[PDB]
Subunit: 240 residues, 4 copies
Amino acid sequence: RKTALVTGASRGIGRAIAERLAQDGFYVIVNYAGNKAHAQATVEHIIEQGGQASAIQADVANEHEVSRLFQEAKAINGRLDVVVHSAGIMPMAKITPESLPDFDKVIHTNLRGAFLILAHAAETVPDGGRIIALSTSVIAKSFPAYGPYIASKAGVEGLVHVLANELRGRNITVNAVAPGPTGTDLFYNGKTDEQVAAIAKLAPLERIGTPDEIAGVVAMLAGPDGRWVNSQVIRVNGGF
Amino acid sequence: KTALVTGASRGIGRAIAERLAQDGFYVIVNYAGNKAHAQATVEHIIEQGGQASAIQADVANEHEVSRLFQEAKAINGRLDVVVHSAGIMPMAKITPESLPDFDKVIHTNLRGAFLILAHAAETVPDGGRIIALSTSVIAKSFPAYGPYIASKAGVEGLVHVLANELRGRNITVNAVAPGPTGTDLFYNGKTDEQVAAIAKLAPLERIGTPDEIAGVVAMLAGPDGRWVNSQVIRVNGGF
Amino acid sequence: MNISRKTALVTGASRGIGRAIAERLAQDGFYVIVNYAGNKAHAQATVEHIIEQGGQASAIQADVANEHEVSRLFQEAKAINGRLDVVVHSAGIMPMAKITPESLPDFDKVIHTNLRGAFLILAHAAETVPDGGRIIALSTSVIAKSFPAYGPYIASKAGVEGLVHVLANELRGRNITVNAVAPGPTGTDLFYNGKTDEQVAAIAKLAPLERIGTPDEIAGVVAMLAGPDGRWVNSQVIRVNGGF
Amino acid sequence: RKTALVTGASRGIGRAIAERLAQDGFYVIVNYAGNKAHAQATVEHIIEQGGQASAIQADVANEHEVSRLFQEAKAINGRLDVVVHSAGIMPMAKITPESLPDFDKVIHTNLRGAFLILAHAAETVPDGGRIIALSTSVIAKSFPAYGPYIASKAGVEGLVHVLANELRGRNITVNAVAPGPTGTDLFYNGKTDEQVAAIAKLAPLERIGTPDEIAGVVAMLAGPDGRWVNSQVIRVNGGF
C-alpha cells in the first residue's frame, strides 16, 4: 500500500484530493497548518468511506516544521510514494509600495513553502513516485490585485519544470495542476448567486467546477495513467 | 456510450480504441486504407470483452467523413466521444521543392482535423467529448518538421476555437500531444542504437508506449476529465 | 560586389499594415518592392507615397498562393538590385466562418491564401535572402483569444508561426533571422469604414491603453526586426496589441 | 529632459541599456548596488559620448533605499519617463533543503526587488511612460540548478503582466526583455576558449550575443516604435 502526503488537506481542493487519493487506495497523510478540526474531519470522512489516513500539523513555510512533517509522514508506513502540495493563500493586493507586507506573506507561504515541500519530496519520494503541485489558471488572465499570488504560483511552476529535470534517472514525475475558480465551501460562502452566475458564465461549460473535478486530474497524475506525463502544468478550468 | 476513433488501425490509435473499449465504450475503429489492421483491432476489442466495429474513411474527404459520421451515429443512435488520431508525418524542409509534401500534410492533418471536428461539433451530444491528437515536437521546431508542425499547430488552434464555439452545448474539446512512442513501426525502422538514443531524451530515460498516451486520452474521455476543456496536454515523459 | 541599395520585398503592401510596413522600410533606406495581388491602384499609391517622401520603390503583381506567380515575383524582385535583403510577408485574408461542414469552402480558401501562401513566400525567401538578411511573417494576436468564427484564420496563422520557428532552425549557419509580428485589431481604413463608433469604442477598451492601435505602430516593430536592433531577435512571435 | 532610470547599470546588460538610452536622448540615472567604480565608469562613458547621466546607489530589495532612489531620481528633472529594471543575481542551486539560503537570497534580490521597482515605478512614472523589466530566456529550458533563478524571473514576468493591467487608464506600457547568455565581461572571464565556442554554436546564428543587442530591444520598447507593445516578454537569444 502506497502512501500519499497532501498539504492543505483540511478543506476545499486539498480535502477533495486527500479523499480521492484515499479512495484510490493510498494511505493519506492529511497535513494541515492550524486548527485540526477540519483536518480530523477529512481523516474521519476517509476512514468512514473505507480508507486509511492520519493528520499531521505543519506550516509548509516553516523549514523546521517541514523537516518534522516529512520525518513523521515517513514514520507511518516507512514510505512516501506521492506528494501533493495544495496549501496556499490568495490575498488580494495591487502592485503598490503599501502592498509590500502582503507580497512578502504570499511569497513566503506559496513560493518558499512550495520550495520546501518540493525539496523534501525530492529527497524522500522513491523511484517511480510522483510529485504534484497546485498552481492556478488565473496566471493566464493577470487580473488586477492578483500580482503577488500569480508571481508566487508562476515561481512554483518554474520549480516544477526544473525539478522534473533534476530528478532524471529516478523515474519520478513532477507536474502541476492549475485550477480555475472552484466551488469550494469558501468560494460559495463569500458570493451572492449573481456573482456565482457571472463566474459560471466565464467558462464555455457555463457552470462552476467542483473540487472533486480538480482532484480527478490530480488522481490521474498520481496513478498509472500519469506514468508518461512529466513536467506539465495541466489547467483544469472548464475552458476559462 | 459510443466512441469513434480515427486512425485506429495501429499504434496510438489502436491503443486508444482498445482502452476506450476496456472503459466500456462501443468503439468505431475508423481506418484509411487496408482493413486488415483495423479488423485486428476490432477483434482484439471483442476478444477482451468489448464491442466494436470498423469503418473505412479518408479523414480529409468531406463525403467519406459525412458517411463515416452518419454510419457511426446510426449504430447506437449516439456518438458520445470522438477521438481524431489519424495523420501523417513526412519530413520536408521549407523549400519550393517540398511544396507537394506540404500540400499533402496540410490536406491530411489539418483539413482532416477540420472535417472531423466539424462533424463532431454537429453530432456529439450534451456532455460529450472531442479529443484531437497533436504532437509535442511543436516545442522543438526541428528541421524538416515544418509542414507537420504547421498542420498540428493549426489543429490546436481549431481545438481552442471549437471549445469556445460549443458554448452552451456542454461539450469539451481537448488535444493530446505525444512525443515519440514505441509503436511497432517505430521499432521496425530504427536500430537498437537509435532506440537507445531516443530513450535517453526524456528524464524518465525510456521509450513511451502507445498505452501511456491512451491513458491520458481515456482520462479526458471519462469522469475525471469533465472539467478539462480547451487544453493541449503534452505526454512525452518530460522531453 | 553589390553597391546597390538594400532591398525589401513586402507582400500585401497595397493598403493597411502592409502599406505602412512598405513606407516605413522605405523611410529606413530600403528600396521597397510593393507586391500586390489584384488591383494595382492602391499599390501604385503606396509606391508614389514612398517616392514623394524621397524613397525608392516599385510595384510587382503576384498572388502569394500561386506558385507560378511567386516564382516570377522572386525572379523579378531580386533582379531590380541583385539582392533581396529583407522579406516581409503581410498578405492574407481574415474571413469569418464557424467550424461547421458548410464552412469548408471558406476554410479551404483561408488555408490556401494564408498558410500555403506563407509557405511559398517563406520557401522562396529561404532560397534568395543573403547571409545577414531578415525574414518576417505577419501572424495575429487573436490566436490568444480563440474567438468564435476565427477558427480557419487562427489555424492558418498558427501554422505560419510553426513554419517561422522551423525555418529559423533550418537557416542555421546563414545568419538569417526569421520572426513573426502578431498584431491585434488595427485602425486601417478598412477597419474604420466597416465599424460603427460603438464597435470601435468597444474594441478600443479591450486594451489597457484604451485606444485602437495604428498600422504605423505595427510597422515600427517590423522595422526593428528588419534593422540593426533586431540582429539578436530570432524565432520570435512578437505580439503588438496594446496589452490585449 | 526625458529621463530614464536603469537599475544594475554598473556593468553588462544594464550598462549597455543605460548607454543606449543616453544615446537616444534620455537623461539616465545609473543605479548601482555596491560597486560605485563601475557605475561611475558607465556615467562617464555616457558623458564622454555626449549624453547626461548621474549615478545613484540603492539595493533594489530594500524598501527604504528604493523609496529614496525614486525620490532622488525624480528630483533631477522633475520627471521619470522610463524605468528599466536590470539588477539581479543568478546563483546555481538544486532544489534540495540545503539550497534554501540561496533560494531565499535569489527570491529576495530578484523578485522582491522587482516588486519594489515596479511598484514605485507605477507610482512615479508619468502617463505615457514605460516600465521594462529584465527576465531570462532560460525559463524555456529549465536546466538543473536554475530552479531558484527561474522561479524568481517567472514571478517577475507575472508581475509585469498584472501591472500592465493595473495601469489601465494611465497609458503606461509594462514589458520584459528576456535575454539568453550574453558576452559580458563576467560571462567571458570564467570561460575557456572551447566553452565559449560551444555556447556560440547553441543559437542558429552561431555566435555569442552582445549586451548591445539586448539594449537595442530595450530601446525600441522605450521609444516611439514601442508605443503599442504592452504586457509582452520579448526573448532576445539569437534563436536559442
